[PDB]
Design a protein around this ligand. Structure first.
Ligand SMILES: COc1ccc(C2=N[C@@H](c3ccc(Cl)cc3)[C@@H](c3ccc(Cl)cc3)N2C(=O)N2CCNC(=O)C2)c(OC(C)C)c1
Length: 98
């Protein structure tokens, strides 16, 4: 496992540093510091949407973010968790590999 170990050294957790606008969002959802796993980022974004009440209480897969910093980042007024392409795009641009 010599070469496989070498390759995966320093890359087993894959922490990211959010860009400053996204960092502010994660902090608003109760995150601390500025290094996270991608899983943590998703947890805090979900929490953010809940605490800012950006989801539709009837159609809870729908997020209305156009009011919000999150909408600015995504470049959208709304999105559905069923079609999460804008979120993928945003996180590719707003997470820096450590
Ligand atoms: C049918 O109602 C649902 C179904 C799934 C989700 C959802 N689905 C999860 C999810 C969605 C897309 C991706 Cl790419 C990753 C994770 C995660 C999530 C994480 C980040 C963001 Cl920005 C939005 C949602 N995520 C949630 O954050 N949920 C999970 C369900 N219950 C919760 O308490 C919150 C959902 O999220 C809010 C819009 C309410 C609502």
């Amino acid at each position: 496992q010599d070469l496989e170990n070498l390759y995966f050294q320093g890359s087993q957790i894959n922490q990211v540093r959010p860009k400053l606008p996204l960092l502010k969002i994660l902090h608003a959802a109760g995150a601390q510091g500025e290094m996270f796993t991608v899983k943590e980022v998703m947890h805090y974004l979900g929490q953010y949407i809940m605490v800012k009440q950006l989801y539709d209480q009837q159609e809870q897969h729908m997020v209305y973010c156009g009011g919000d910093l999150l909408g600015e980042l995504l470049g959208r007024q709304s999105f559905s968790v069923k079609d999460p392409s804008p979120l993928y795009d945003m996180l590719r641009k707003n997470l820096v590999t450590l």
